[PDB]
Amino acid sequence: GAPPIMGSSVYITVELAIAVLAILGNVLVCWAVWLNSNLQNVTNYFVVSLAAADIAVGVLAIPFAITISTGFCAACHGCLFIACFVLVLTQSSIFSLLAIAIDRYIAIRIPLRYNGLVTGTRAKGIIAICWVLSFAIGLTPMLGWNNCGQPKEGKNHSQGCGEGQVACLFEDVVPMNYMVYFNFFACVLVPLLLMLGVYLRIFLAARRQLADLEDNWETLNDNLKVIEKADNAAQVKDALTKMRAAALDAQKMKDFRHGFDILVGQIDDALKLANEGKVKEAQAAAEQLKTTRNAYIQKYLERARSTLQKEVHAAKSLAIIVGLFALCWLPLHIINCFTFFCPDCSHAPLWLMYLAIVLSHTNSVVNPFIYAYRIREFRQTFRKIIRSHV
C-alpha cells in the first residue's frame, strides 16, 4: 500500500485546480450581470444566486473537502459543519434551478401577466427564503441526526484524538440514512424530477402555441380560397364567420393592433355585403384582406414564431444546466445508495470515492461555459469584460 500522501497530493492538487476555475468563471457571470442591463432580469437573479453558490464551492467547500480528507482530530460538531456545508450549497443550487424552471414556465404560459407577477422584489425574497431553507436542510445533521453519539473509538484512539473529538471522516459522522433518504431522495431527486416535469411542460406549451399560430394562419388562407370559388352569398358568409373568429382569437403593439383592426373591419365589410346577398361585392371585399395579410398579419406571425423559438432555445440551454448538475452529483449519490442498501457489497474503493467527489465539484466550473456557448448576451458581455480588462 503506497504512502497515502501520494494519492492525497493528486487529490488536493485537482481540488485546488477546480476551485480556481469555479471562482473565475462564476465571478465572470456575476460581473456580466452587474455590467449589462440586458442581463438584469428576474431569471438572471437566480443565475447569480446559483453562481454565488458555485463561488462558495471554490472558496469554502473545497478547502473543507481537502480538510476532511485528512481524518484530522476534531470536535464532532465542528467536523459535521465541515462535512455538511457543501450540502447547503448544493441545496441552494437545487432551489435556484427549480426557480429558473418555474420562472420560464410562467413566462411561456402567461406572458402578459409575467412582469406583474414575477418581480425583482419578489425574486429577492424567494432567494433569501431559499438560502435560509438550504442552511436548515444541509445542516440537519448538526441538529442531532448524526453519528457523534456512536464514535469509532478504535480509530479515535489510534489517531490520538482528545475528549469530545473524533477522527473527522465523512462516513463516520454523517449518517447514511440521512444521505440517502433525506438528502438524496427527498431534497435532490424529488426536485430534479419536478424540474424535468416543468421543462416538459414548457416544451409542450411552446409546441401547442406554435401549432395554434400555424392553424390560425392556415384557417385564414384556406377560407380566403373558400370565398374565392364560392357560388353563393351563404358560402361566402360561412367562410367569413370562421375567419372573424380566427382573427379575433389570434388578436388575443401599435402596428400589430392596427393590422388586426383593419383585418376585422375588412371581414365585417365583406360579411355585411354577404348578408345583403351581394356575392361578387363580398368576394371583391374579401380579396382586400390579402393586402392586410401581406402587410401586417404575416409580420406578426413571423415575430410570434420567432419569440417562441427563442424561448424553446433558452429553455434547452437552462435544461442542459440541470442535466449537467444531475450528471455531476448522481455518481456520489448512487455510491451512497450502494453503501447503505448493500451491506454485503464491498465498499466502493477510495480512488472512486475521490473521483466522485471531484466530479461533484467540477459542476461548479461548467455553468459559465454553458452560458458562453448557448446565450449570446452572456457571450458578448464576457468578450467585452475580457478584452477590456484581462
Ligand SMILES: CC(C)CCC[C@@H](C)[C@H]1CC[C@H]2[C@@H]3CC=C4C[C@@H](O)CC[C@]4(C)[C@H]3CC[C@]12C
Ligand atoms: C466567513 C468565512 C470566511 C469564515 C470561515 C469560518 C470557518 C473556516 C470555521 C467556522 C467554524 C470552524 C470549525 C468549528 C469547530 C471545529 C472543531 C475543532 O475541533 C477543529 C476545527 C473546526 C472543524 C473548525 C474549523 C474552521 C471552521 C469551519
Ligand SMILES: CC(C)CCC[C@@H](C)[C@H]1CC[C@H]2[C@@H]3CC=C4C[C@@H](O)CC[C@]4(C)[C@H]3CC[C@]12C
Ligand atoms: C449518473 C451516471 C453517470 C451513472 C453513474 C453510475 C456509477 C456511479 C455506477 C455504475 C456502476 C456502479 C458500481 C458497480 C459495482 C460496485 C461494486 C460495489 O461493491 C460497490 C459499488 C460499485 C463500485 C458501484 C458504484 C456506482 C457505480 C460505479
Ligand SMILES: CC(C)CCC[C@@H](C)[C@H]1CC[C@H]2[C@@H]3CC=C4C[C@@H](O)CC[C@]4(C)[C@H]3CC[C@]12C
Ligand atoms: C436519477 C434517476 C436515474 C434515478 C436514480 C436511480 C437510483 C436511485 C438507483 C439506480 C441504481 C440503483 C441501485 C442498483 C443496485 C443496488 C444493489 C442492491 O443490493 C441494493 C440497491 C441498489 C444500491 C440500488 C439502489 C437505487 C439505485 C442507486
Ligand SMILES: Nc1nc(NCCc2ccc(O)cc2)nc2nc(-c3ccco3)nn12
Ligand atoms: N460517502 C461520502 N464520502 C465522502 N468522503 C469520504 C470518502 C471515504 C469513504 C469511506 C472511507 O473509509 C474513507 C473515505 N464524502 C461524501 N460526500 C458525499 C455526498 C455529498 C453529496 C451527496 O453525497 N457522500 N460522501
Ligand SMILES: CCCCCCCC/C=C\CCCCCCCC(=O)O
Ligand atoms: C480566495 C480565497 C480562497 C481561500 C483559501 C483556501 C486555501 C486553504 C486550502 C486548504 C486548507 C486545508 C488544511 C488541511 C487540514 C489540516 C490537516 C491536518 O490537521 O491533519
Ligand SMILES: CCCCCCCC/C=C\CCCCCCCC(=O)O
Ligand atoms: C428574515 C428573512 C428570512 C425569512 C425566513 C424563512 C423561513 C422559511 C419559512 C417559511 C416560508 C415562507 C415564509 C414567508 C414569510 C414572509 C412572507 C411575506 O412577508 O410576504
Ligand SMILES: CCCCCCCC/C=C\CCCCCCCC(=O)O
Ligand atoms: C444568506 C444567508 C442566509 C441566512 C442563513 C442562516 C440561517 C441558519 C439556519 C439554520 C442553521 C441550523 C444549524 C445550527 C448550527 C448549530 C451550531 C452548533 O452545533 O453549535
Ligand code: NA
Ligand atoms: Na452548484
